[PDB]
Amino acid sequence: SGFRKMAFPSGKVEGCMVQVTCGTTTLNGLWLDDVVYCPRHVICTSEDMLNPNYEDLLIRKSNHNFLVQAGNVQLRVIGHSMQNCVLKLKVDTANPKTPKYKFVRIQPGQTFSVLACYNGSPSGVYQCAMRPNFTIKGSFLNGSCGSVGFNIDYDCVSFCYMHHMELPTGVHAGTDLEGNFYGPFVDRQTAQAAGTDTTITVNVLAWLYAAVINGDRWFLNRFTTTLNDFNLVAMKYNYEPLTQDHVDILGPLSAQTGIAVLDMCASLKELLQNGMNGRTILGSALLEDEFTPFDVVRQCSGVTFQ
């Protein structure tokens, strides 16, 4: 028993992190096979960031201008190209520690682990959700860019995020591993506004099911409700609307606890209107939305990986 915000084990990713230096800037890169991936703003100076023309700046760089280091081993760049907002550096040595991997573009509300790195070296690991406004609320300092987010399925590492920037508001924005930003952001030093950050309703329900599995049952009430009636209340509190796909995804948790989704929705409705009255659920005084239904099943059943 117990419930924790659990990250994936990071060992398979630790062996892929390298340090990338171009001119004076030093960021993290991700070394898979014989290619290193890193944010293209590694080629910028502090002055270029206000309005960078990446194509023009990249012309002034040659293969020998990029210094890639893996601990103390040194890689020779024999080819470079820009793909959207990431640089692909072809090196001479394939990474012997390359795991079974895949590049995936996640959807808002999905969760992943971040391996925060500085100078190519791992600093720590934590779990987070992609917010509905395509930001993440991470922990990143200068030099952490190029750190990656990932999931592990079976023996395969699915890379889904590379960190690029901190917004003036303190939240974080980045790309998939093909270099397409999540959200409308651009890699330029200019005022950018994220949208409204709504609560991931299907995740909150999954976490309420986790609470019941672990013995916190006080919020379970007599009422029930309808999907339309619930969504009308949810949207007033900036909760994402619930759809039938969401109800389908919660089916196995319903089956294990004997509590129907709409009944659970009626408990949530009352929690939104009346608050929590100074009580807690799974050790929290706020409704938590960084666990997907799959995260709950995974943790409550003990799924392991390679």
Ligand X SMILES: *CC(=O)N1CCN(Cc2cccc3ccccc23)CC1
- Point out the residues that are catalytic: 41, 145
Q: Is the dihedral of CA 35, 104, 29, 298 positive or negative?
A: negative
Q: Judged by CB under 8 A, does residue 96 bind a copy of itself?
A: no
Q: Judged by CB under 6 A, does residue 43 bind ligand X?
A: no
Cβ-proximal residues to 162 (8 Å cutoff; 6+ apart), any chain:
30, 37, 39, 86, 146, 147, 148, 149, 174, 175, 176, 177
From 52-60, 110-118, 183-191, 245-253, span contacting a copy of itself (CB under 8 A): 110-118
Among 125, 156, 186, 247, binds a copy of itself (CB under 8 A): 125
Q: Judged by CB under 6 A, does residue 40 bind ligand X?
A: no
Contacted by 189, from a copy of itself, ligand X, none: CB < 5 to 8 Å by type? ligand X
Closer to ligand X by Cβ: residue 109 or 138: 138
Closest CB to ligand X: residue number: 145
Cα 139–144–145 angle (5° rounding)?
Answer: 110
| Least Å from the CB of residue 60 to ligand X | 18
Among 19, 111, 144, 225, binds ligand X (CB under 6 A): 144
Contact 226, 165 (CB under 8 A): no
Cβ-proximal residues to 68 (8 Å cutoff; 6+ apart), any chain:
18, 19, 20, 21, 29, 31, 36, 74, 75, 77, 89, 91
Residue 9's DSSP bridge partners are: none
Closer to a copy of itself by Cβ: residue 10 or 95: 10
From 4-12, 143-151, 202-210, 280-288, span contacting ligand X (CB under 6 A): 143-151
| Least Å from the CB of residue 104 to ligand X | 22
Q: Is the dihedral of CA 179, 14, 23, 167 positive or negative?
A: positive
Closer to a copy of itself by Cβ: residue 9 or 252: 9
Instruction: Please state the length of the chain.
Output: 306
> x/- site string to a copy of itself, residues 132 to 161, per CB under 8 A?
-----xxxxxxxx-----------------
> x/- site string to ligand X, residues 19 to 38, per CB under 6 A?
--------x-----------
> x/- site string to a copy of itself, residues 172 to 211, per CB under 8 A?
x---------------------------------------
From 45-53, 228-236, 261-269, 283-291, span contacting a copy of itself (CB under 8 A): 283-291
Contact 81, 88 (CB under 8 A): yes
Using CA atoms, how far apart are residues 289 and 205, in angstroms rounded to an integer?
8
Q: What is the DSSP string of 144-211?
A: -TT-EEEEEETTEEEEEEEEEEE-TTS-EEEE-TTSPBSSS--SSSS--------B-HHHHHHHHHHH
Contacted by 172, from ligand X, a copy of itself, none: CB < 5 to 8 Å by type? a copy of itself
Among 15, 23, 122, 143, binds ligand X (CB under 6 A): 143
Contacted by 49, from ligand X, a copy of itself, none: CB < 5 to 8 Å by type? ligand X
| 68 half-sphere exposure, CB direction, 13 A CA radius | 28
Using CA atoms, how far apart are residues 137 and 187, in angstroms rounded to an integer?
18
Contact 16, 70 (CB under 8 A): no
| Least Å from the CB of residue 91 to ligand X | 21
Closer to a copy of itself by Cβ: residue 129 or 266: 129
Closer to a copy of itself by Cβ: residue 83 or 284: 284
Helix axes 201-213, 293-301, angle to 10 degrees: 20
